[PDB]
Design a protein around this ligand. Structure first.
Ligand SMILES: [Ca+2]
Ligand SMILES: [Ca+2]
Lengths: 498, 498
């Protein structure tokens, strides 16, 4: 097996003087050999300070060359980095560090004061004390390479109450990189220039983007702050060959690319990759229209990485398993062998092979729910189409059951999203008078526009929606309740309207 | 890890009703599911007859759907197939089966009578008794899946006195397939139609061609006998997307493709792959001119599979390591850490990682010579170019040392191959009067043409060859001595001329 460390080690023997890390705004460029030397330097310093293999170390920082070096240094030492979203609230981060029994926390700095008040025994390490614009503070003797074993913890990543600590074993790294070759069509070579739009604390941003970029002897371009015009200019200046972005970022990029008066040259870009399950047909058409390269839709989890994909997608919900993957659709709430009959809806489950996590840290119960008899349960509903592909229908937990029939809010939300005057929509089930749920739509008007239940119903009646799927009721609201991460709080919304 | 069996098993869950095996001349087509059922059937029958996991079974047969099924059935049972070139002499095959301590031999049938006379305890199994045009003789209870372990023997393949039995471990299969994705640019999908030009008893023909074709959810097209026109027609009829062929086959294919009056449509073909180290510049130009698709040169061994490659090659000897690979150039006859200074010639050695063989069967001494301190020694001479690529110079054993300077016959042979009137040439060293060797060229004239030492020397003097490299002597011969496999016997030639 090639661990992350080993893939990078091998790449550096092959392409020592080729650019590995580029930070164009900062004018910082490091070769594969230069990066390896700085990783080794930081690792040695961390070891001298007391850090030992298989100890867990939290990382709380936005994307940057310094955090790339820190994460890889921790891994080189043999510590287990636990990458955390720095946009989370301080007390929430402190709780997770406490729950995780971390030896230390490497932070970009009032998070430290929060860790001190939690009672945690985690030693605070400021990122700025380790490495500054690629330059390490060097000390301590050279250190041994730790023994890495296939099933052993390598990295911890967090999911969407509190986020769960998914443990990624050493053996998972290779296939979490190589799917980008088998599915997406990346190949080895010094032509590879990868734009780092995805967060490093997301499995895609780390394995599929950063690690893939370097493992294939290419360049990772660091983007600290997202700006659509700045990103497209970087495509031209750095000759970016591939980008992985969110639907939100892609919509922004497509719009910035759409001007006739623009001098932008996007010719180098050959791959545009995304998780487009939630992507409306309209966003997908603008991506096809205004951005070059092959478009590939992927379906992925923190827990299992890549399970389905589609080249040149026409919609965001239709995909099929690729290399590495084995999938089934089973009776909702049933055992892993209870295969549905074709055309019937069930839960998508995916074989837990080398890419799969080994469990959630200190949560035995949640693990038992997700990993059963060699299979990872997605908690998503799906169906086999007449063409033998998988149609993702939505989350099991979002499903509305009205008169004993399954309705998926995501489908209704996509239709209603295109109705005149609608800027936002969330579809929920509210309790009816016959022990079921009634389909209910909460809608926000475009600025200055007037919505009415009658006009929205008139629009739904003209659509392809089956009768039983049309909302029975509308709530017209000035705004929807959202957390600090711009995610709709479905449960708080039910309470506000009901 | 995915063993060969596991890669095929997973592919069949993904694409059960897609064509896996096509024999167009015979009108035979089998889906992934149909192939798996026949593999399972033959495996069960083999087990009932007494065959058990980790027992070695020789296979002596030309390419066909039946041998594909037999090999995969042996592997499914857990036996270790030892694939042998059926063009070898009977007593030579019998000797190798004896030396290998085989439990049995599956043969297309006077090889059987030879095995009986060798004294071997190998039970003879005729291929025609197991499966006929895809149809198995079925009996016996269903059998357990054997435990497969990473380091455990999986397949045996033979090299170029007697051929050596290279043991390929279970863990080697995945990277021996996936290099075709990282290096050559194949990707997962039902678009894959692979033409089976390479012999199944060659590691390329098995892992890189057959197993890759199926593992990626594609089709393997069986070719029992090579014919250039028939092969190109199959490209059109079956919509072949990739082919791997010898330089000899490629020259034949290019010529057949070169007619303006031809109706052939080769548009589906996107990848033409070859081991082109021995390929002259002229053959490479005709391939570029007359065949479509991306051309990729690979450097490979039975022992280590893929160690170097080049996309869109301009010559056959300049390549660089790809994904999986780590290479060094060391002092000839020295230790694995004795790196040469750049520009100096040495032996190419390659890291023995997952793809590597684990040793030669029953030959401890030959193993110790080839596998040292984590490295496989190629026995090829090479040099790092000013551009940081590897230039393959030829075999260590072929090198001529004249006045203390290294001369490589392959270089001289390529120049002399283009001289007026020359149809064949072999360059050898003969003992001089100062304890060294003199560069000597043995040449065969084109039919009816007259060669002379003077005209050949005149041609060499006009070439880019350094003074010290030009032949001091010519032997003009009506033919060169060759074995039954059309390979020049270098040692018999020295004796004939000296
Ligand atoms: Ca309000
Ligand atoms: Ca003769």
């Amino acid at each position: 097996m090639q661990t992350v460390n080993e893939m990078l080690r091998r790449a550096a023997t092959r392409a020592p003087d080729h650019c590995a890390l580029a930070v164009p705004a900062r004018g910082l460029r490091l070769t594969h050999a230069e990066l390896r030397a700085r990783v080794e330097a930081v690792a040695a310093r961390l070891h001298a300070d007391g850090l030992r293999p298989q100890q867990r170390v939290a990382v709380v920082a936005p994307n940057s060359a310094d955090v790339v070096i820190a994460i890889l240094a921790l891994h080189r030492l043999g510590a287990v980095p636990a990458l955390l979203n720095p946009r989370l609230k301080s007390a929430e981060l402190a709780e997770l560090i406490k729950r995780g029994e971390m030896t230390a926390a490497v932070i970009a700095v009032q998070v430290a004061d929060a860790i001190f008040q939690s009672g945690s025994g985690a030693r605070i390490i400021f990122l700025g004390d380790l490495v500054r614009d690629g330059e390490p503070y060097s000390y301590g003797p050279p250190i041994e390479d730790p023994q890495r074993e296939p099933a052993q913890p390598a990295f911890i990543f967090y999911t969407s109450g509190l986020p769960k600590a998914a443990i990624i074993p050493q053996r998972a790294a290779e296939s979490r990189v190589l799917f980008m070759s088998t599915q997406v069509g990346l190949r080895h070579g010094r032509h590879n220039v990868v734009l780092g739009l995805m967060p490093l604390y997301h499995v895609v941003g780390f394995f599929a983007v950063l690690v893939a970029a370097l493992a294939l002897d290419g360049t990772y371009v660091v983007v600290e702050e997202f700006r659509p015009v700045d990103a497209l200019q970087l495509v031209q200046q750095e000759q970016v060959t591939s980008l992985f972005a969110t639907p939100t970022h892609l919509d922004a990029l497509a719009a910035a690319a759409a001007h006739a008066g623009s001098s932008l040259k996007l010719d180098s870009l050959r791959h545009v990759t995304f998780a487009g399950a939630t992507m409306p047909d309209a966003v997908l058409e603008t991506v096809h229209q205004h951005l070059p390269g092959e478009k590939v839709n992927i379906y992925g989890t923190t827990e299992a990485m890549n399970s389905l994909y589609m080249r040149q997608p026409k919609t965001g919900t239709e995909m099929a398993p690729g290399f590495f993957s084995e999938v089934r659709i089973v009776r909702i709430g049933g055992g892993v062998d209870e295969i549905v009959a074709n055309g019937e809806e069930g839960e998508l489950i995916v074989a837990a092979s080398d890419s799969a996590f080994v469990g959630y840290l200190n949560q035995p119960q949640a693990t038992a729910e997700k990993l059963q008899d060699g299979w990872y349960r997605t908690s998503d509903v799906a169906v086999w189409t007449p063409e033998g592909t998988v149609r993702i229908l939505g989350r099991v937990d979002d499903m509305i059951i009205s008169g004993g029939e399954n309705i998926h809010p995501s489908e209704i939300e996509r239709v209603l999203g295109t109705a005149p005057g609608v800027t936002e929509v969330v579809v929920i089930g509210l309790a009816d008078q016959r022990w079921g749920q009634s389909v209910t739509a909460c809608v926000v008007p475009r600025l200055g526009e007037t919505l009415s239940a009658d006009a929205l119903d008139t629009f739904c009646r003209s659509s392809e929606l089956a009768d039983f799927k049309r909302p029975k009721r509308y709530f017209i609201l000035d705004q929807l309740p959202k957390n600090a991460l711009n995610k709709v709080l479905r449960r708080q919304l039910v309470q506000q309207v009901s």
